[PDB]
Symmetry: D2
Subunit: 268 residues, 4 copies
C-alpha cells in the first residue's frame, strides 16, 4: 500500500511546519516509512513541530559544523532504530548563508569567512552526512538533498547560488562513494516554497530593489511553468523526494530531478 | 497497493519481449494499470507477444506516419476503454532510422529523404501522438517518451542522435500544450538495453570499426555508472517510466529523467 | 594587420543589408579576407546588395535543397578562386520554416511536410554544405553556422526551435568529419537581430498574443544581458563569427559560442 | 597588426615556464599588449621566469588570501602603469587545493579547513580580484579566468572539481558586476596541460590506482577531441584567452569558452 512501506529514513532540516523537510517527513510517514529526525540548535522548538507529524519519531541533535556530532551520529541513529537495523534513506534538507552573502548586500562585499560558513553548511555537509551515514545504510538505499537551480545567475541569491553550484558537484562525488554501498545520491531542484529560510533572504527588511527583483523572480515561476507553480504548497516537492527515496527510480544517481513545474525548461 | 492503481494508460512500441515498451507494459499491469496497446505493421506478431503480459489488453494498429490512423486513434481508444472514460497516461516508445542514417554508413552519405523519415517517426510523432491523445486525457495525466542522451556526439548513432536532439526540443513544446490539459510530458533517457532496435544499429553485419566502437561505448556505461548498468535488464528503465506515469513526480514536466545508472554524470 | 588576412571564405545567406551574413561578409573583408558569396532564389536582388560590400566578390547560386547545385558547388567555387587554391572558411547563415511551423499557428497544426522542409534547410544543409566543401578546405580551416539557443522552449519559435536543436546535434557530427581535414565546425548562438527572417516570424500580420509574447521575449534580452543587447546592430555577432574563422580559437570545435550579451547566463 | 595592440593587461598565475599564465603572457606581448604581472610567494623565482618573456613587465606580489595585498593592489597597479591609465584586461590563472582534497586521498577524508582553503584560492579570489580591479578598468575591458570542465565527476580531481563548479557560478555573478563598468567576465575551460599544478595532483608519488585513472582520463582527451589535443602545448589555450581579451568576442559574458579540442562535445 505505502510507497516507502517498511523503509527507515533519516530526515534532517525541520525547523517549522512550512519546512520543506516537514512536508517530506509527513509524506514519508503517510507512505509507511519509519523516521529518524535531525534538528539543529532549537531542539525543544523542533520537537513541538515534530510532535504534529502523523506518527512519532525520535529526534536527534545535528549541527553539521560540529565534528563530534558527526562522529557520534551513526551510533546515535543505530541506538534509535535498533542494533542490526539500517537506514534505507537519508534526506539532507539543510542550508545557511550569512546575511552578507545574499539579499541587498553587494556580492563583492561578502567576507570569505561568511561565504565559507555558508558553503560548509549548504554543500560540504552533504558529503559529511553521507560519510557518517553510508556505513549504516542498506543496499538499494537513497540519499537525497535539496537544490535550487544555480545554472544561471540571478538577483539576490548571490553566494547561496555559488553554494548550490558546489552542492551539485559534491552530489556527483557522493554518488561515486555511495555506489560502493548499492546506494543512490540525488538532488531535488525545487521551485520557490514559502519557508523560513525564504523569509530570511532579504533579511525581510523592506522596500529595497532586491525585494522587488525577488518578487519578480518568484512570479516568473508560475508563468513559465507549463503546469503552474504554487509557492504555498510544498507537497509536490515532498512527493518528488519520496519518489527518489522509493524503489521506482532505481537507475538514477549523481543526478538532479526538477520539481519546479517545468519552469527551468522554458525561457518564457 | 498498486502505483498505477486505477489508471488507464496507452503503451506504444511493443515489437518483441525484449522491447522497452513490453517491460513498461508489464510493470504497469503489475502496479494495477489498465492498458491499451499500440503496434505497428506486424500485428499478429505483436499480439502473440502481447498475449504473454500478466493481463489482457486491447491492441490497436498505429503507424505514426499514417494520417488516417492518427485521426481515428482517439475514437478507437475511446471505443476500447468505454465512452465517458479517459486516458491517464501515454507512452511513446517508438523510433526508426533507415540504415543509411546509422552504423557503418558515413554520416554525410545519408540522403535527406531517409533522415526525414527517421525524424518523422522518432521525433515528430511525439507531437502527433500528443495531439491525437490530449483530448482524451484526464487532468493529472502523464505522457512519457524514450530518449537516448544526444548532448554529445558519438560513433554510429549518427542521424538518430540528431532525431533525439529534435525529440528533446519537441518534448519541451509538447509540455506547453499538455499543460493546458493538466497533463505532464517527459522523456526517460535510458542507458543501452538489448532490444531489436539495438541489433539493427550496425545492420548487425560484421567485423567493422563501427561495431567495435559500439561495443566500447556500451561497455563504458557500466564502468562510468556509480551503481552499475545491466544492458540485459530493462526493468529499471520500466520502473522509471512508471514513476513518471504515477502521481509521485507531480511537478516535473518538459523534462528528461536519466535511467542510465548515473553514467551521464561521470566523465570517467 | 587584418584578422583574416589572406584567408579565403565562403559566406552564404545574404538576402538584404540587415542579413547577419551581410555583416559577417563586411567585417571579414575589413579584416582582409577574400570572399565567395552564395545566394538563394533572388540573385539579381542579392547582387545589388552584395555590390555595397567594401570589396567585390563572386556570387554563386545555392539552394541547399537542390542536389545538382550541391554537387557542382565545390567545382564552381574552385573556378571562382583559382585551380590550386582552397577555402579556409565556410559560413552557413541560412534558415527557413514554413509559416505553419512558427508564429501564431498552433504547434500541433504544423504538417510534417512543412516541418521537414524547415529542418532540411535549417539543419541538414549544415552537413550537406560541409560535405560539399570539406574537400576544398585547407587544414586549419573553420566552418561556422548560426544558432538561436533552443535549450528551452519559448513562444512562437515553435518548430524552428526544433530545427535549431537538430542543427546543434548536426554540428557535433560535422565536427567529427571536419577533424579529419584539420578543420573546426562551430555555431554562434546570437541574440535577436532585426533581419528579414525575424520580420517573417509572425508573418508580421498584427495584434495577436504571439506578437506581444515575441516583443516581451526580445526585450528580456537587453535586460538579462550584463553588457546589454542591441537588436539593431549585428556587428558584435559578425565579429564573433570572424573570431571563429580566425586562428585565435584554434582548440574549439563541435561547439557553440554565445553572442547574446551574456543573456543565456542569467535567469533574471 | 597586434590583436591586443595598445591594451594593458594584468596576468596572474606565472610560476614556471610551463604555466598556462606564462604562455598567455607570451602570446599577449607578441600581439602588442602591455603587461603587469602578479606572482605569489616565490617572487625572485617568478621574476627569473618572467625575465624570459619577449618584453619586460612589472611584477607585483599577490597572495589572494592576503587582504592587505588585495586592498593595495589597484593602487600598486596604477603606480606601475601611470596615473590616468587603466587596465583593459585581467587574467586570473590561479588555483590551489591541499593534498587531502585531491589525488589518492579519499573524497570523504578531506577536512573542511582544507576544502575551504582551496575554494578561497580557486573560486572566491575570482570575485575578490574583480572587486579590486574593476575600478581601474576601462569600458570594453575583459576579465578571464581558467576552468577545467566540472559538469561531471571524475577520478582524482575530487574537491578541485567542487571548486571549479563554484568558480563557474562565481564568474556568472562577476559578470553582473562587471557589466556596470562595460567589462566582460569569462572562463576558458582548457584541456589538460602539463604544468606544475598538474604534477601535484597525485602528489606525484607513485603506482597508485588514482595515477592510472588520471593517465586514462588524460589520454581520453586526444581520442575524443575531433581535432586532437596536445597536452604538451599550452599555445592553443593561450590564444583562446587572448581571443577573449580582444575586441572580437564583444557580446560574450558570464560564459565559458572550451579550449579542449572539442573533447567535451563528444561522448566517445
Ligand atoms: N524554500 C525554497 O524555495 C527552496 C527551494 C529550493 C531549495 N531549497 C533548499 O531546501 C532546503 C531546506 O530549506 P527550507 O526552504 O525548507 O527552509 P528552512 O529554514 O525550513 O530549513 C533550513 C534548515 O536548515 C537547518 N540548518 C541550518 N544550519 C544548520 C546546521 N548547521 N546544521 C543543521 N541544520 C542546519 C535549519 O535548522 C533548518 O531546519 C535547503 O537546502 C534550501 O536551500 C529551498
Ligand atoms: N534499447 C536501448 O538501448 C534504448 C535506449 C534509449 C532509448 N531507446 C528508445 O526506446 C524506444 C524503444 O526502442 P527499443 O529499444 O525498446 O526497441 P524496439 O525495436 O523494441 O522498439 C521500437 C518500436 O518502434 C516501433 N516503430 C517503428 N516505426 C514505427 C511507426 N511507423 N509507427 C509506430 N511504431 C513504430 C516498432 O514497431 C517497435 O515496436 C525508442 O524511442 C528507442 O530509440 C532505446
Ligand atoms: N536574426 C536573428 O535574431 C537571429 C538570431 C540567431 C540566429 N539566427 C540565424 O541566423 C541565420 C541567418 O538569418 P538572418 O536572421 O540573418 O536572416 P535573413 O532572412 O537575413 O537570412 C536568411 C537567409 O536564408 C536564406 N535561405 C533560405 N532558404 C534557403 C535555401 N533553400 N538555400 C539557401 N539559402 C536559403 C535566405 O536566402 C537568406 O539569405 C539563420 O540560420 C537564422 O536562423 C538569426
Ligand atoms: N594545466 C591544466 O591542465 C589545466 C587545465 C584547465 C585549467 N587549469 C587551471 O589553470 C590555472 C593555472 O594553473 P596551471 O595549470 O597553469 O598551473 P601552475 O602551477 O602553472 O599555476 C598555478 C598558479 O596558482 C598560483 N597560486 C596558488 N595559490 C595562490 C595564491 N594564494 N595567490 C595567488 N596565486 C596563487 C601559483 O603561484 C601558480 O602561479 C588554474 O586555475 C588551473 O586550475 C589547468
Ligand atoms: N535553507 C536554506 C537557505 C539558506 C540560504 C538561502 C536560502 C535558503 O533556502 C532557500 C529558500 C528559497 C529558495 C528559492 N528562492 C530564491 C529566491 C530569490 C532569489 C533569492 N526566491 N526563492 C532557495 C533556497 O536555497
Ligand atoms: N527504436 C528505435 C531505434 C531506431 C533507430 C536507432 C536506434 C533505436 O533504438 C535504440 C537502441 C539502442 C540505443 C542505445 N544505444 C546506442 C548505441 C550505439 C551508439 C550506437 N548503443 N546503444 C538507442 C536507441 O535509440
Ligand atoms: N533564417 C531564418 C529563420 C527562419 C525561420 C525562423 C527564424 C529565422 O531566423 C531567425 C530570426 C530571429 C531569431 C531570433 N528570434 C526569435 C524570436 C521570437 C521567438 C520567435 N525573436 N527573435 C532566430 C532566428 O532563427
Ligand atoms: N592551479 C591549480 C590547480 C590546483 C589544484 C588542482 C589542479 C590545478 O590545476 C589543474 C591542473 C590540471 C588540470 C587538468 N587535469 C585534471 C586531471 C586529472 C583528474 C585529475 N588531469 N588534468 C586541472 C587543473 O585545475
Amino acid at each position: 500500500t505505502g510507497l516507502l512501506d517498511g523503509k527507515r529514513i533519516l530526515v534532517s532540516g525541520i525547523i517549522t511546519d512550512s519546512s520543506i523537510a516537514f512536508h517530506i517527513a509527513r509524506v514519508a510517514q503517510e507512505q509507511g516509512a519509519q523516521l529518524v529526525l535531525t534538528g539543529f540548535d532549537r531542539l525543544r522548538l523542533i520537537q513541538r513541530i515534530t510532535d504534529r507529524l502523523p506518527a512519532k519519531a525520535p529526534l536527534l541533535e545535528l549541527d553539521v559544523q560540529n565534528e563530534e556530532h558527526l562522529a557520534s551520529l551513526a551510533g546515535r541513529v543505530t541506538e534509535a532504530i535498533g542494533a542490526g537495523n539500517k537506514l534505507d534513506g537519508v534526506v539532507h534538507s539543510i542550508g545557511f548563508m550569512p546575511q552578507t552573502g545574499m539579499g541587498i548586500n553587494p556580492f563583492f562585499d561578502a567576507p570569505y569567512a561568511d561565504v565559507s560558513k555558508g558553503i560548509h553548511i549548504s554543500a560540504y555537509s552533504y558529503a559529511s552526512m553521507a560519510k557518517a551515514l553510508l556505513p549504516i545504510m542498506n543496499p538499494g538505499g537513497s540519499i537525497v538533498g535539496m537544490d535550487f537551480d544555480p545554472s544561471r545567475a540571478m538577483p539576490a541569491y548571490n553566494w547561496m547560488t555559488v553554494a548550490k553550484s558546489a552542492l551539485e558537484s559534491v552530489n556527483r562525488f557522493v554518488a561515486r562513494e555511495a555506489g560502493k554501498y548499492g546506494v543512490r545520491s540525488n538532488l531535488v531542484a525545487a521551485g520557490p516554497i514559502r519557508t523560513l529560510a525564504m523569509s530570511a533572504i532579504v533579511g525581510g527588511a523592506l522596500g529595497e530593489e532586491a525585494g522587488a527583483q525577488i518578487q519578480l523572480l518568484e512570479e516568473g515561476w508560475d508563468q513559465r511553468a507549463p503546469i503552474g507553480w504554487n509557492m504555498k504548497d510544498a507537497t509536490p516537492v515532498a512527493k518528488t523526494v519520496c519518489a527518489l527515496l522509493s524503489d521506482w527510480l532505481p537507475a538514477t544517481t549523481g543526478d538532479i530531478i526538477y520539481a519546479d513545474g517545468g519552469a527551468h525548461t522554458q525561457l518564457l
